[PDB]
């Protein structure tokens, strides 16, 4: 399951989902750190 943290990019749309898959640069960096630990 792909996590959707509250601090992601909010899509101000009344016709679809209220949150977007775009993430802050910190989330990208943190995700890489978790990726490295699973790579082990």
């Amino acid at each position: 399951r792909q996590i959707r943290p509250y601090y992601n990019l909010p899509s101000k749309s009344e016709h679809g989902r209220k949150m977007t898959g775009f993430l802050t640069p910190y989330r990208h960096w943190m995700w890489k750190q978790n990726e490295l630990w699973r790579n082990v």
């Binding site: 750190q33 978790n34 490295l36 630990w37 699973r38």
Partner: protein
């Protein structure tokens, strides 16, 4: 891939998916519950008359007392036993050759069995996850970098054949008698 999908049990790809090893449970009360470590497709083949590709073993969740305490006693002999069966040759065939998937409960059980290392989810709260630093990692690699030929031989023995004949074996294989 369906008009109205099965919301209560979806999957990731089409049917029948890749083989996956999982502990199929029965539909009985908890008191007499037991699991079957079996390999089956990603989508359950409950429709057809053939449900599983292979039967690996059976696991009993309820611990039983040591019925062999009067035998030769060792350390922690009198603790409760959790009896379980596991096929080894079939597991290794499906895991290495066929490259089947693996769930988390079978992974933990095989970690206990010693076939596989402890699972990804078998994490304690004592220590958090490691933090990686590229410069430190590169420094450690430079400090401890293995030889090219040594690493090649190690991976060749691990992956290709490990039954490599020596010079003595080759000489013994070579005919020496009058060649007929």
């Amino acid at each position: 891939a369906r008009a109205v999908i099965k919301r209560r049990s979806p999957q990731l790809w089409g049917a029948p998916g890749a083989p996956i090893i999982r502990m199929r449970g029965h539909h009985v009360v908890w008191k007499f519950q037991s699991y079957d470590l079996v390999v089956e497709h990603t989508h359950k083949r409950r429709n057809s008359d053939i449900r599983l590709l292979h039967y690996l073993g059976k696991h009993c969740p309820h611990p039983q007392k040591s019925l062999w305490s009067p035998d030769t006693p060792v350390a922690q002999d009198r603790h409760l036993f959790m009896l379980t069966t596991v096929d080894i040759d079939a597991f290794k065939y499906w895991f290495g050759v066929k490259r089947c998937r693996l769930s988390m409960k079978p992974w933990a059980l095989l970690a206990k069995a010693g076939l596989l290392p402890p699972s990804l989810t078998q994490n304690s709260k004592i220590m958090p996850k490691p933090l990686f630093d590229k410069e430190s990692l590169m420094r450690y690699y430079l400090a401890n970098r293995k030889d090219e030929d040594v690493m090649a031989r190690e991976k060749y023995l691990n992956y290709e054949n490990s039954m490599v004949k020596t010079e003595e074996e080759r000489a013994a294989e070579r005919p020496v008698a009058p060649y007929l």
